[PDB]
Each structure stands twice: as structure tokens, then as C-alpha cells.
Amino acid sequence: AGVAAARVNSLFYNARKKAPAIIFIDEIDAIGRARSTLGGDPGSMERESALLAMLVQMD
Amino acid sequence: EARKEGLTGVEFRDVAGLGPILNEVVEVVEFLKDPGTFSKLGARPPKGILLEGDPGTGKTLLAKALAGEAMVPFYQMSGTEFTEGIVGLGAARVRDLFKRARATAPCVIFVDEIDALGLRRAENDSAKTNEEREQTLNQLLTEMDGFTPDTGVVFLGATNRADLLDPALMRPGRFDRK
Amino acid sequence: VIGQQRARKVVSTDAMDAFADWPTVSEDFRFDAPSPSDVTWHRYTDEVRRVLKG
Amino acid sequence: AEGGVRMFTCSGTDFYDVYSGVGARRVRETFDRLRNAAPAILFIDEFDAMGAARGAQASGDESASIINELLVQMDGFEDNRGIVVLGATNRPGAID
Amino acid sequence: AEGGVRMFTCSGTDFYDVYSGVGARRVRETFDRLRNAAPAILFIDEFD
Amino acid sequence: AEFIEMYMGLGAARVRDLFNTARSVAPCIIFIDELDAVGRQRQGGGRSNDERDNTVNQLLTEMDGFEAEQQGIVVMGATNRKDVLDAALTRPGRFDRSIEVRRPDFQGRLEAVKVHLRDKPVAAEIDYVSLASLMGGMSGAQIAGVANTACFLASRDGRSEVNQTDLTLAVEQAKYGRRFVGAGRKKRFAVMEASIALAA
Amino acid sequence: AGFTGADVMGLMARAARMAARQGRHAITEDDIYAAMENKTM
Amino acid sequence: SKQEKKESQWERLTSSRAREFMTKDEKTGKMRDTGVRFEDIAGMEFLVTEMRE
């Protein structure tokens, strides 16, 4: 748990460190999927947590 | 403590209506009573047979009837008990019993209601419920895989619904006959 | 059907005489003739009535 | 009143637990509690909750654990010192 | 600007974090800051 | 079978593992079974799809993905039905060639049965044309099973070989099956079959 | 027709970029129209 | 040790895993390249103009 968030954090951070650069996430469908309202499984937890990190970083 | 009964007292005469398939048990009973005579030409014994039949068919005693015919150490306990509500100790009983078998061979292990561990991991249940069930079932997989035919221990699984079994226990060389 | 399970034996006749039926199992080989026409249905239900009365 | 024994009461769903296996532990606890106070009567209302059939509910793990633990508790029950277990329910056929 | 009052800004994502022991403290902190800095107006985007 | 599991992200992990070790041992041939059970259409369905298709798209980024190439390794997959696979998987550029494996032909059975007898003690009065024109419709595993039952029945009979009649029975039992019927019901069967045959 | 405020911001930014592509440092009116034309193709 | 074992395990698990291109991959003296430009792409005229600018 928390590993996906730390990973996107490190990616975006070191990308901001060597600016100007380009990031390319192919197939964000597996990470930028719309958050559902059902499903209490850990996978949803980590996926939307990575999604939150992705968001707050890109904004 | 694991329920190991020394000598059984259940016979091949005290079960009826299964004569045609009974041959298998009788054959296995010779292999385990004389493990060196099948080391003669190399006839491969079963790794472990999972007894199948909807409940009330007697899957428990006819295994214990094999145990009585062989007077070998019979090891029985409920597979469902391998997932008590504490993480990590479910697999502990597995290893304990498998070394007990490797020590008191020639013996026969029996665990009715193991498909409770071998029913395919649901896509609707809690992971925390399935996580230690996962861990225990993988303990059984890896342990009974670590078993040799020459250790002189026959495994017996029992459940009523074969269709819910996961394809990992359905592997030949893990559960050869059914 | 969304079936069930009970500890009962087979019914006296109605579940034992259901052994002569051969139901349908696959959906793409089901036959159903066109329904009768309420002037044919008259004569068919009249045959049923004759059987019951006899 | 005619058994000269002690009476004990609880409900079935009392053994259903949001925590895994604690149903089994509380089954053990009740069983030993009654064992040390033999002879006695142990009456259980709401019985079909714990004594429900297998698979007919969405609680395979939990109810399965409850029933197997209670049976293996009363399977090896040879030290019955005059006690009884009286489970009360409305559907005797839906029982396991 | 028309009311002539201090303004603060935040966002739903912040207080949201799956690890324990944070949200309640962050909310209490925001509100006590506001209180000590009143009058004010706390715009909070994407409240949902 | 080792790609289907519900824990967090392990499918994509094992996919990356197989593919990076095949890149390290390159050149190579990566053959994979059970593709229809995993490579189904990405959609909502159940909850498992939040994981199930995840693995899939990791698959998708190993065949073509980025990196623009690795060596040019050959990736081969066995699936029963192509119509059920994902759209991205079956696209020219990830699976260049597509070949069908039907049931054995006439001469196909002719050859498949005779290559299955050098491992069998057999006689010399064997003309495979009758079997090839007699076993039409079966798969290869069923021909091998026919040979297996022939050998086992030769053992249980007390002989040392298998000739014409031997195979004929074996295939006749493998095709038309093998229960009691009363002598009262048997005459119904006889009357109806005889009437149909007389009519036709 | 059918736009939103965000799309209006984006369209005037596209017009700025379209004028810059023409080398002109002064955004003219046609850039506006130019926006609609490049979204089309 | 006992404390920073899991720190190392963490930042290994939680490391950056994006492949880095067009930076000096001078572990041996290289820099990873893709090797396709706006000429070996034939068809998306509009997209190539957009990204050119």
C-alpha cells in the first residue's frame, strides 16, 4: 500500500527537477480510470490513491 | 493437537455399494503396505486422491476404511479449520501435520472440507478474508509438492463440489486420481 | 430455474413419471410451432374436455 | 425446574462475527463455560441463524467455521455429565 | 473583494488521504485558523 | 493458470518477469496457453476486471509497448476462439500471423494413427486405410486414446499384439459408447426401427 | 453555440497560438475563425 | 541494521521506474534514443503540424 502514490510522486518530482521535460504515460486507462462507488477491495484503494497523487501533482 | 488415530477398526467390509471403484483403494492399500514392491518396476503411486461426492456418501469413513485396512497412521482434521481468525497460524498446522506424516510414515493423511481452501478465490469477498486463505492454500500446494512418492504417505482430500475447485489443486502430479 | 436443494426423496409419481420427458437443454434448437387460432384452440380444448369427462 | 439443573440462554446470531474466527473462539468459550457447570441445559433461541444450511447464505467462510467448530466441539463430546443442548427454530427442514 | 474580507483557499484532495490519523486534525486546524482570522471565507474546490 | 490471481498487481508483475527474462535470454520463443480466459474484452462486468484487464494492458505494453523493440522475439499464444479475444490483442502488429488447427483430415488421420504405432507392439496385417476411413470425426488425443485402449485390452486379453478386429472394436467402443434393457422394452425399439427402415 | 466558459478561454488561447504561428505578434480576428478551422480537420 | 533495512526495501519498491530517454545514459557513454522523427510518420499531417509548433 502507498507504493503507487510514492511512485507517481517520485516520477513527477524528478521530472519537475530536470525541467523542461516530457512525461509520457501510455495506457493511463489502468491508472486514470473513473473512480466507482462500489467495491471495498484494496486494489481500488491503491488505484484511486495513485489517481489522487497523479492529480495533485499535475495541477 | 491433530486428530491422529493409531489403528482404525473400520474395515473394507463395513462399507457397501461402492465395490466397482473400491478396487482403487485396495490397490493403493497394497502400495502403502509394501512400498518397496512397487519400487520393483517403478509403478507410480498417487500423490494424493481427493475423495468427491455430495455429502452423505461417506467420503470420511471409506478413507478411514482404507486406514483401517492398512492399520497405518491416519491423520484427519477439517480443512476449513486451516483458516481460523488469526493470520499466519493457519499454515502452521499444515507444516506440523506434514512433518508428522513424514515422520510416522507409512501413514495416510486425510483432510475433509479442503475445498473450503480450494474453492476459487471469489471476486466479491474481502481480500483480508482471502489473503490468509491464499497463504494457507499455497502452504498446502508447496508442502504436498515437496512430498516424494517414496516418503510412504498418501494424501486424501474430500469435498462434495468438484466444480468449485481451483485449477492449481487440479494439477496432475498434485492430485493424480479423483 | 433459480433452483434449490432439499433432503427429500423423489415424489411418488409426478417426479418419477417425469422420467419419460426429455426436456430441452440448448436454446438454439428449441421448436415452438405458431400458436393456434382460437378456432383451432376451440377444438383442441374440446378434446381435452372430452378426455376429462370420460 | 424438573431437571434440578442450571439454565443458560443466548441467541444464535450472537456467534456471527465481523472478525474472522472469533465466532469459533466464542463457540469454544460458551462450550467450555457450559462444560464446567455440568449438568445443565443450554437453550439457544434464533437457532437457524447459526444452524443455517451451507451455501444458501453469503457467509460461506463464517457460517462454515461456526458449524464445523460447533460440531467438532460436540462431536468429541463424550463427557456429557447430564447436560443437554436445545436449539429452537421454526424451519426444521432448512437445517444442515 | 466587494465584502472586503480575507479569503482562504483549499481543495478536497488535500484532506483526503488513505492513511490514518490525519483528516480530523487537518479540518480542526483549518477551522481554528479561520476562527482566529475571522471574518473570512474559505473557498474549497471540488467539495465532493 | 499462473497469470490468474486476485492479489494486488501480481499479474502484471509476472508478465514483466516473463518478458524481461525472455529479453535477457533472447533470442527466444514465448509460448502461452489459456489466453481466452485472461484476454477477454475489457469492460466493467465484475469487480475482478479492475485487476483482470490491468494485467492485460501490461501484456499489451510488452508485445509492442514503448522501447520500439527488444530483439524481435517470437510470442505465440494458444486460444480456442479468436472472436473472444480483446481487440488490441488480435491486431496486426502484435500477432502478425494467425493459423488454424482443425481436426485431422483423412490422410491426416492416416498418418497420425501410423506414427502412433511404432510405440506399440503390432502385427503386420494392418491396412490403415480402413481406420482412416473409419475414425472420421475424432481429434488427435482421441486417436491416441484409441491406441491406449487397444494396448490395454490386448494386455487384459492375454495376447501380445493387436490386429484388424482389435482396433475396430477399440474405435467402435470409443465412438458408439458402451445399462440393462428389459425384453419388453426391447421389442418396442425393434418395431420402431424396423418400421422406419422399411419406410425409408 | 453550445460552448462553455472554459472552452472560450481555450479558444482564445488557440487563437493566440494561431496568430503566433503566423509570426504576427498582434492577434487578429481571423485567428478566432482559424481556431474553428483547425479543430475541424 | 534493523531500521533502515525497510527504508531501503521501501525506496527500492517505491523508486522511479520510468525509462529515461534523451538524457545522457552515460553509464557506458550512451544516451537512449527512439530513432523516429517527423518524416517517418506518413498520414497524420494535422497532428504532426500541431506537435511541430
Ligand SMILES: Nc1ncnc2c1ncn2[C@@H]1O[C@H](COP(=O)(O)OP(=O)(O)NP(=O)(O)O)[C@@H](O)[C@H]1O
Ligand atoms: N456409502 C456408504 N455406505 C454405507 N454407509 C454409509 C455410506 N456413506 C455414509 N454411510 C453412513 O454414514 C455414517 C457415517 O457418517 P460420517 O462419519 O458423518 O461421515 P459422512 O459425513 O457421512 N461422509 P461425508 O458425507 O463426506 O461428510 C455411518 O452411519 C455410515 O454407515
